[PDB]
Each structure stands twice: as C-alpha cells, then as structure tokens.
Amino acid sequence: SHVTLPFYPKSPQSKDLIKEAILDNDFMKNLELSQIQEIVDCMYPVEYGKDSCIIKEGDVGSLVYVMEDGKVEVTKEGVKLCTMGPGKVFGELAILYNCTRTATVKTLVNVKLWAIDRQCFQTIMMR
Amino acid sequence: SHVTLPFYPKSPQSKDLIKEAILDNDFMKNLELSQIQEIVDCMYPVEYGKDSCIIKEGDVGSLVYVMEDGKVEVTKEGVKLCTMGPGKVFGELAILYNCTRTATVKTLVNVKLWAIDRQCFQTIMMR
Ligand SMILES: Nc1nc2c(ncn2[C@@H]2O[C@@H]3COP(=O)(O)O[C@H]3[C@H]2O)c(=O)[nH]1
Ligand SMILES: Nc1nc2c(ncn2[C@@H]2O[C@@H]3COP(=O)(O)O[C@H]3[C@H]2O)c(=O)[nH]1
C-alpha cells in the first residue's frame, strides 16, 4: 500500500552537514525542505581507504554521495578538476547525463561518506 | 471554493498510451492510480515538425510531456545522450527538482505529444 524507506540514525552534527552540502549543490539547492529532511534520514554511511577509487568516469551510476570526513580528487580524461573536502555533494551528475558517471573520484586520504540510491531518491521526489 | 482543473477529451487508445508512459517513468511509477487518471485528463495535444527544438537546457520548465508519435533526440552541453520514442515521458526533471531545464530536446521527425502544465501537475500530487 506504499513501500517503506529505510531510516539511518545520525548525529545532529551529521544531519546538519548533509543539509548544508545539498544546499551548496547547484543541481539540488532548490529541493523542498521536507524532501531534504527525508533524504537525510535515508543516507547510509560508507568508508573508503586512501588511494581508493569511488567513482570511475564512464561507469553506470546511481548513488549520490556527501563527504563527511576526508578528501578526494576529481579527474576527467586525465586532468585534475578539483579536490573536495567535507560538506560537498558529488555523484549527482550521473542522472543528468544518462546515468553515466561524468568524472572519476579517487580518495587522497581515508574518507567517510554518506550515500543514497537512485530508488530512495525517486520515491522522495514524489512527496 | 477550490480551483477546477481543465479537461481535454481523448481517444481510449491515447488514454492508454499515456497511462503506460507514466508507469514506465522512474519517478511517476510512484503515483496512485486515482492521480494518474487525473493527469491523463489534464493532458492536451501539441505537434512539432521535424527539426524543431521543444526544450532548451537552461530555460525555465513549465510543462511535462508524453510522446505519442515520432522520435526525439536529447542532448546536454552539445552531446547526444539518447533518443526517445512513443510511450516515453519527458521534461519532468526541471519540475521535480525545481530547477532549470537540464537538457535540450530536439525532434528527429514530426512528433505528436501530450502536455500537462506545472499548475495542474502539482495540484494533482496534493491529495
Ligand atoms: N564532471 C564533473 N564532475 C565534478 C566536477 N567537480 C565535481 N564533480 C563531481 O564528480 C562526480 C563524478 O560523478 P557524477 O558525474 O555522478 O557527479 C560528479 C560531480 O558530483 C567537475 O568539474 N566536472
Ligand atoms: N538531463 C537529461 N535529461 C534527459 C535524459 N534523458 C531524457 N531526459 C529528459 O529530457 C528532459 C529535458 O528537460 P527536463 O530537465 O525537464 O527533463 C528531462 C528528462 O525528462 C538525460 O540523459 N539527461
């Protein structure tokens, strides 16, 4: 009669970081505040070690990430585009380019992230 | 005193094409049926010729479309992402993400579409 989204409990400071990361993101700054709240409770945590490759350009890609701790470097076709520290969203562009990753993301140090899948996202967007 | 949504009369064949098109859409799959029916009745027909530009990335989005006949070609910042045939919904991103058109959409052949405007569309998602 309607499918249940999963809830992942977080520290207040974490929920704040996420909200701010979305509001700082060009594609998503305008979402409902009620929608953002829901996204925050759905994001689950994932950790990567340094010289780990999170996203490979060209790949198919659902997941969207917010960085909590650490630092990554974004490269396309060989070129550094930038680095990203906590408070930044990445992985959003896949959907806008036909679910294909548009750049590769490598970890420069250990990182702690939050993630959310295509599917959760879509249910939310219809509320 | 509540607002009256418009009604555009349609061939049962067309009412089904639309319904299917909605269910095929990642986001709209999610709607209750009562609502998918309301949306079907608020769609109005529009045609474009070969080599027409329906949607321009960056512009403001007010309508959402379903294709009935024809083939259309999606592009972003100058790169063929995909093509779309009958039965497929489009122009739903800008509305849901409350952003500016995320891709350009050009016709490859003469097309016949149905359109619902932001107004009716949102009004419907609220019951
Ligand atoms: N393509 C691109 N991606 C970037 C840039 N800066 C940060 N990113 C992030 O890198 C991500 C790579 O995967 P996505 O395309 O899913 O989403 C992309 C963005 O979130 C940039 O300058 N170009
Ligand atoms: N940005 C983008 N839009 C697409 C793609 N494939 C289909 N579309 C549709 O094209 C529409 C362009 O305008 P919208 O951003 O409103 O909504 C978009 C989607 O419905 C794609 O790969 N990228």
Author numbering:
A (entry chain A), B (entry chain B): 92 to 218
Sentences from the paper on this structure:
The cGMP-binding site is comprised of three parts: the short P-helix together with conserved glutamate and arginine residues at the PBC which captures the sugar phosphate (Site 1); a key residue, Thr193 at the end of PBC that bridges the cyclic phosphate to the guanine ring (Site 2); and the β5-strand that provides a unique docking site for the guanine ring (Site 3). The exposed backbone amides of Gly182, Glu183, Leu184 and Ala185 of the P-helix together with the guanidinium group of Arg192, captures the cyclic phosphate through several hydrogen bonds and electrostatic interactions. In addition, the hydroxyl group of Thr193 interacts with the equatorial OP1 of cGMP, bridging the phosphate moiety to the guanine ring of cGMP. The crystallographic dimer is formed mainly by the bound cGMP, the helical tip of the PBC, and the αB-helix from one molecule (molecule B) fitting onto similar regions on the second molecule (molecule A). While cGMP in molecule B (cGMP:B) is partially exposed to solvent, cGMP in molecule A (cGMP:A) is wedged between the two molecules and participates in crystallographic packing of the two molecules. The CNBD-A bound with syn-configured cGMP shows the lowest B-factors, implying that interaction with the guanine ring is strongest at site 3 compared to other structures.
The cGMP-dependent protein kinases (PKG) belong to the family of serine/threonine kinases and are one of the major intracellular receptors for cGMP. To understand the overall architecture of the cGMP-binding domain and the molecular features required for cGMP binding, we determined crystal structures of the CNBD-A of human PKG I bound to cGMP, cAMP or in the absence of bound nucleotide.
